[PDB]
């Protein structure tokens, strides 16, 4: 549905160097274009590109923590149930969705027991994963979700593919 | 120049997914009205394997990886889907529970329906922590929860006052 | 008007190496990308082509029976009037239909003769031609159309191009 | 590397035929509703020459090879138009007739219309059989039939009992 | 607004050797295709260059009256009232239009003044401008714009963009 | 073969305007409705500079030559505009005034328009003839008028018998 790929991204680390397309050639054996090495921009073939350093060289901020990789932008959403504890908070996430519930009690009584109580919410299946975004608070019952943010809005729909290796599942803007 | 290649790769972006027409229309350019589809083609100029189930073809397993991974700013856990696509396909991390649920369409005739499902289920509260724990299929159906087994620690594991309450939360160590 | 092309059948010669393109490098001349060379997949050229055996590699089950080339599918198309001896029918070929003509006479009467007849056929621009199908029979009066199939649905529409010579003619599906 | 080039043909797939955009529309990808045109431009990537017309372009007569071509498996006659597009060309193989008619609109008026047409007709028993000769036209109009002179081989030829009479069905040989 | 580029005039100058393509990379380099340098037809890049020659080799009939350039069509506009000397005549050019206005008296009189004149104009956003095109007279009061010809229907507007530097300014057919 | 390179300038024909999808469409095939549009993306098989405005963009002022430029063929004079897009711009040519004229919306609100105009103006008769001299602007709204300064040579100058009045006419020469 939703034409998206990460254009920039993948452009930058072809470029920082005394040719854009070396770091291609170089990187998918050496100068041997009729055997196939590709002169990249616009006639480009696999991301084979197995020698480490091009999929470090975008983002060493993404760490290397796993491998290939080629990396992400990264962003927060906030789940900022304004009361409680972080004891109140509980939290889920799912696919295309992110949900928090804030449960808390005000008050016993005599008869009973005050509920106050919150749902907090967003679906935004090009922003927040189950994966790519982890997640973090405040004392206030605020509950962050934050990170390598998510970047793809696929045809198929369930699209949480990053094993800590970001791309190719950085194939779309933020949207 | 000094002589090197790479190949065997070069079949992929062909038809790393099935090679439909709206697969290429998601990933070739940018989202606007007059934008064309430039969809699949023996004349597109690359074929481009940068989309994000076409790196996670070779992946396949995405290494399968179930364990140690452990300790770390990296427990992993593979729950496995023997065969199913990602949209048969759906993960869900709830407090102490990470499953994935499976549900394909084997067969269909006359008025008769044939689903099939997996469902790989957890409970594993001092392992799992769906605020630092974070979920990644492969193509072929293999999730793989990764990250930290350590942020809350708590038995629900839901205690998360982890910005200021910091003896007790880790009290409850990388167990 | 039909979009139609022989895409896999193009790919398929081009693979069967140490590389996807030096088959046409080696084929076009030897290394020499700057005075034109083309790394094939999706940026091409003239099939000049004219080193012989590339013409002979991806179906030597064609022959050679002619040159230039590139070879075909193959498939029949059945006649079968289920009567008579096969002196009775009669066959002609025409462009985008295949005909026959079953011709008996049952019995011989004081009165004069009794006709017993068939018309059969097909319409079928895309898979029959007076041309790249020959034929043969069997003796029930069965007529049957054979061999390397058309593959040709041209915009133009009289396609029957193919001297023994079988792509470009190769350009459509079975359809 | 050891360093060889052809170049001379490169012209030819920029226009093969007079480059339409409803032509490379016809070859270019796979015949779903959102596979876009690619339909022409000094951006397509290749110009490619794989299309029906386009390879029997430089072979123009193609070869326009009109016997001797003898007794075997290929036994060959040209009919020639001297020039007419396929389209204006209609090839017919009846029993013991080979014909191919032409008819061109040669020009156009008022309410008057200038039709030009080519005839060239035969009558060959002997040496055509509509089972097994089979009719190749030319870009230029120039239709060869070719194939074995010998299936069927009686006088109209239709004696057709070949696949089970053999002494006199080939008591007219290949002759 | 108006589909339109001079793709003749562009293939033109890389085609007159024994390479369609060395007059690119011999002119945005030589022979470092890894490096950039592009096949040309249709993958192609900046028109970078600057070796002065190209520039010059498709109309040295455009005097290389100022550098990049690459060169014109010709032509004129004939402004011919029909009347009077040329002192009658004033001219003024303006973007997309140009115009001219006679301005006699015929005769004087007792009582005033016999004024006879005209306005002649064509409003030719792709063929005249005030800039590429320069102009000329006969002593009929005929006013004629003429030279190396508008090319340009730019989706801006205003395009008179030629500072005798006639590309890329002939971007368009004579429309 | 012999090894020489320039890359820096491949940046711009990506984003030489903004990169609208209706640019492209202008500038990539032909004006047929079955035509398509290869209208930005990457995928598109070159990134082509080509079009007006986009060589216009490295000259930026256009060289921004006021003067001398002088008594030959080639007099030219520069109307700055010192930052407006070319449709903002709009030059007029008319006897002894050449004017350019800038009109800009800076901003816009409620019920409010803040338009900004540049008018850079002259009267120049000896120096301009609208005959002959020739108005140029670049992407920054920079003007050059430039030709001979000598067709006409009067006071309005409109004197313009130049044709046949040949004294006269050159009696006020390229002064």
Redesign the interface.
Known sequence: ???????PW??RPF?PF?????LF?QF????????????T????????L?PPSFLRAPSWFDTG??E?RLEKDRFSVNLDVKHF???E???????DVIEVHGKHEERQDEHGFISREFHRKYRIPADV???????????DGV?TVNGPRKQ?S????????????K???T?A?K?
Do not use: C, N, Q
Not at 18 to 22: C, L
Not at 28 to 39: I, K, M, T
Not at 129 to 139: A, G
């Open positions: 549905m939703d034409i998206a790929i990460h254009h993948i452009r470029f005394h040719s854009p397309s070396r050639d998918f054996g050496e100068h041997l274009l009729e055997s196939d090495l590709f002169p921009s616009t006639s480009l073939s696999p991301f084979y197995r923590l796993s290939m504890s972080p004891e908070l509980k939290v889920k996430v799912l696919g994963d189950p994966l790519t975004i982890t997640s973090s608070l405040s004392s509950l793809v696929g045809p198929e729909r369930t699209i949480p593919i990053t094993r800590e290796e791309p190719a599942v194939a803007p949207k």
